[PDB]
Each structure stands twice: as structure tokens, then as C-alpha cells.
């Protein structure tokens, strides 16, 4: 029948078809009707296909990012389920959205027979930035059932750490035969080789990690002073830590008022440097998807 990812209610095929239909058939007049604004509907802008022309100008400019309004998913009838699936399961639904955006970029020149080459588009890795995901409920009013959900937050940036290299591919070299392998990171863990991969050289513990040949990515930590819309009785303001990655690094400066939409994350923190013992109480942070 139909397959569902374990732990979720998300189907790759169903979400892909629904978001493809949404991208092909959305008009901003739907957003006007949803926000109860009938008198402001105009012919020349609202009745034009919004994401079609946005993906077209994305193709002309070389842009690889789509800024998606989550309220627009509620404007469309077929994606009202998908909206909730974007809020509850951002990690795979965002990947589904990126894959179908790539499919749409291929389709807009396959169907219409444009002169753009397919190699440059299919080499590019398109990714989506959902924003306006809902009401800006506070950090301290969130619960552990909100882990790995999409959250929208107000704030003021106080400071940012320098550019931190987080290691994506690892480069190991043999000491005796100079044979090297590259291993990808898998959920934060790199498998170092016990034996040399060569058939001729199989010496144990001969693989050493060369830290400058292995590839890194950008990771930055920003301390954000939150300004909630609603503040409970005697709540004293706090600072959150938000992690930005890749392109979003150094996009927020100290002292600006920003709109962060991201993923509510929790990790265990080691009690001591020498020991692998973790603390039962978890540390919460925001994995940032989009900054307004």
C-alpha cells in the first residue's frame, strides 16, 4: 500500500506530490482569502503563479534557496496536512521539499524546452528555508515533546562565536604505504579504520588522521536575547544559544533584532572532559533554518 517513516506519519511520495502540486498551483490570492482579505485582491500580482516565477528567477540568478511561507501551505487545501508535517517533522519534510524543488527546477526546462543546461541545475543542491511557522511562543513555555519541531522566535543578538570547523569528511593515511581513505560522517560519528584497506598492506593501527586534508564545514554559535510577545508573571529574560550552519554563518551581527525560525534541539553534555559520561539533564538549542 503506502509506506510511512517510522516514528512519523510522513510519506515521501505523498508529501512530494502534494508539495509539487502546491509549487505548480499556488497563487497569492489564496493567502489573501486565508487572511480574510478579500478587498485587497488584485489581478496583476495575485493571479500570477507565485512559486513558478520565483523558481524561474531562482534559475536566472543562480539562486539555490527558496524562502517558503508556512502560512501559504495553510492557504492551499491539499497541503494543510503538510503544514503540520513541516512543523512536527522538519528533518525529513525539508529534505522532501528540497528534492521536489530540484525536480521542479528540472521540470521547468524539460517541459518548456529552455536553453539552460541540465548539468548545472542537477549539480546544484537546492534547499528550502521555511519561515512564519506559527505563533511565537516562548522558549521557557516549550516542553520536551516539542523537540525536533519547527519553532519561530524573536530576539536580539548579543554576540557570536568565531567560525567553527565541524568535520564532515575524514581523511586517513597509512603510515607505511601512504594509502589513504576518506570516510563520511554518519550522525556525528566517524569510523576510523582499524586495518589498512590495501590488499598488499594490511598492517593494524597504521591509519592516522591528517587534520588538514579532511574537509570541514562552517558552524557558528550565536547568543540571542529573546523578546517574547507574551511574558508570564515575573519571568526574567534569558539568552538562548542558536547554531547556524554553512551559508548562514556571519549573517547575524551583534545588536540586531531578528526573526529566527529553526529546529528545537536537545543534546546531552559530557560531565568531564576525560570521561564519556553524559548528563541526564539535556541542553536545549535552536538549529536555525531561516533568519528574517
Amino acid at each position: 500500500p503506502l509506506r510511512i517513516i517510522w516514528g512519523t506519519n510522513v510519506s515521501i511520495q505523498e508529501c512530494t506530490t502534494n508539495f509539487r502540486n502546491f509549487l505548480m498551483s499556488f497563487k497569492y490570492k489564496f493567502r489573501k482569502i486565508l487572511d480574510e482579505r478579500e478587498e485587497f485582491i488584485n489581478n496583476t500580482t495575485d493571479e500570477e503563479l507565485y512559486y513558478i516565477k520565483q523558481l524561474n528567477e531562482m534559475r536566472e540568478l543562480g539562486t539555490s534557496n527558496l524562502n517558503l511561507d508556512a502560512r501559504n501551505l495553510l492557504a492551499y487545501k491539499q497541503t494543510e496536512d503538510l503544514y503540520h508535517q513541516l512543523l512536527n517533522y522538519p528533518q525529513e519534510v525539508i529534505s522532501i521539499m528540497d528534492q521536489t524543488i530540484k525536480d521542479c527546477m528540472v521540470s521547468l526546462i524539460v517541459d518548456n524546452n529552455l536553453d539552460y543546461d541540465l548539468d548545472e541545475i542537477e549539480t546544484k543542491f537546492y534547499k528550502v528555508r521555511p519561515y512564519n511557522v506559527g505563533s511565537c511562543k516562548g522558549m521557557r513555555e516549550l516542553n520536551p515533546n516539542d523537540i525536533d519541531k519547527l519553532i519561530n522566535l524573536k530576539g536580539l543578538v548579543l554576540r557570536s562565536t568565531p567560525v567553527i570547523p565541524d568535520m564532515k569528511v575524514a581523511f586517513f593515511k597509512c603510515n607505511v604505504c601512504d594509502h589513504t581513505m576518506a570516510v563520511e560522517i554518519d550522525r556525528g560519528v566517524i569510523q576510523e579504520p582499524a586495518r589498512c584497506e590495501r590488499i598488499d598492506c594490511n598492517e593494524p593501527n597504521s591509519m592516522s588522521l591528517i587534520h588538514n586534508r579532511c574537509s570541514f564545514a562552517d558552524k557558528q554559535v550565536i547568543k540571542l536575547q529573546e523578546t517574547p510577545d507574551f511574558v508570564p508573571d515575573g519571568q526574567t529574560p534569558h539568552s538562548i544559544s542558536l547554531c547556524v550552519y554553512d551559508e548562514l554563518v556571519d549573517s547575524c551581527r551583534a545588536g540586531d533584532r531578528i526573526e529566527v525560525t529553526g529546529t528545537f534541539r536537545s543534546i546531552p553534555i559530557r560531565a568531564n572532559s576525560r570521561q564519556r559520561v553524559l548528563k541526564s539533564l539535556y541542553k536545549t538549542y535552536v538549529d536555525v533554518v531561516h533568519v528574517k
Binding site: 509506506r3 510511512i4 517510522w6 502540486n21 498551483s25 528534492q99 530540484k102 542537477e122
Partner: protein, 165 residues
């Protein structure tokens, strides 16, 4: 294929030439039922009775000329027949689809390992899949496409030409 997948000698992922009988495709064959059964022979003989009269004009039209430029002679055969087998049994008794990107993503392939279990077609004018055609007819994009005439202009010119031919 892993050897566990191909273990079966009846169902195979790749096509095998098992031939078959009674006008069926040679690759699927006759796995569901056999034509050697008596009852199958009876129904085939009953259809054969109907087919004699139909086959007589078929033989008579092309006996000597391919064209209609025109009682019948037929080659004897040593091999058996459906009627002789019937006689022996009596002696015993007595979609266009949407185009998609070539390359998939690593996160997309990682999600295949996490999946468990719980009329329709594709419109290229709107470039969307639909659950039912009659629901796709009543939709803002299809009706907005219908009221526009600037995208059938070539058609229009052809219509005009074909009006005064």
C-alpha cells in the same frame, strides 16, 4: 539480486522463456492454470465450435490470392489436436507522469531504510497529479487555463485554415 530473492524457480525477477499455451504471452506463461485439464478442454472445444464458421471465410478469402481477385484444401498434420484430445477424453470417460530530477539526495536515500507500512492520473496542462479527473476539472488553475485563449493561438490559426479548406 541476492540469492535469497532468486531462490524461487516459479517467480523470477528477470524474464524467462517458459512459452505457454492458448495465445498467452511466452514470458508469463500459464502458471495460474493448465490446458491439459478436461474441463479446460471442454470450454476450449465449445469456443472452437463457435470459431469454425468464423474461420471458414478466413481460409476461403486468401486460399490462392492475397487480394480479392477470386472449395478449400488443407494440409494434413501428424501432430495432435484439441478435438482428438477431446475424443481421447471421451474414450477415457466411456500515463504521462511528471518528469523528475536524475540524481537523488543522500538524505533521501537515508530515508528509505526508515519506512514501514501504515481514475487517477497526471495533467500536463496544469502539470499536477490528480486523484480524480472530475475534481481536477473543477479547480482554479484548470478553469483559469480554460478561459484563456492565448495558449491555443496556433490551434486557432489551424482552425481558421481548416475552416476554408
Amino acid at each position: 539480486w541476492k540469492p535469497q530473492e532468486l531462490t524461487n524457480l516459479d517467480e523470477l525477477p528477470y524474464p524467462i522463456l517458459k512459452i505457454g499455451s492458448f495465445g498467452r504471452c511466452p514470458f508469463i506463461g500459464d502458471r495460474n492454470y493448465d490446458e491439459s485439464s478436461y474441463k479446460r478442454v471442454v470450454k476450449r472445444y465449445s469456443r472452437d465450435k463457435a470459431n469454425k464458421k468464423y474461420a471458414l471465410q478466413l481460409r476461403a478469402l486468401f486460399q490462392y490470392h492475397a487480394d480479392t481477385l477470386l472449395n478449400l484444401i488443407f494440409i494434413p498434420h501428424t501432430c495432435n489436436d484439441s478435438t482428438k484430445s477431446f475424443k481421447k477424453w471421451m474414450q477415457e470417460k466411456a500515463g504521462l507522469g511528471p518528469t523528475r530530477a536524475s540524481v537523488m539526495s543522500k538524505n533521501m536515500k537515508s530515508l528509505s531504510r526508515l519506512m514501514v507500512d501504515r481514475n487517477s492520473g497526471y495533467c500536463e496542462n496544469c502539470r499536477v497529479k490528480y486523484e480524480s479527473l472530475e475534481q481536477h476539472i473543477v479547480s482554479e488553475k484548470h478553469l483559469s487555463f480554460a478561459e484563456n485563449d492565448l495558449n491555443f493561438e496556433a490551434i486557432d490559426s489551424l482552425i481558421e485554415n481548416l475552416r476554408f479548406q
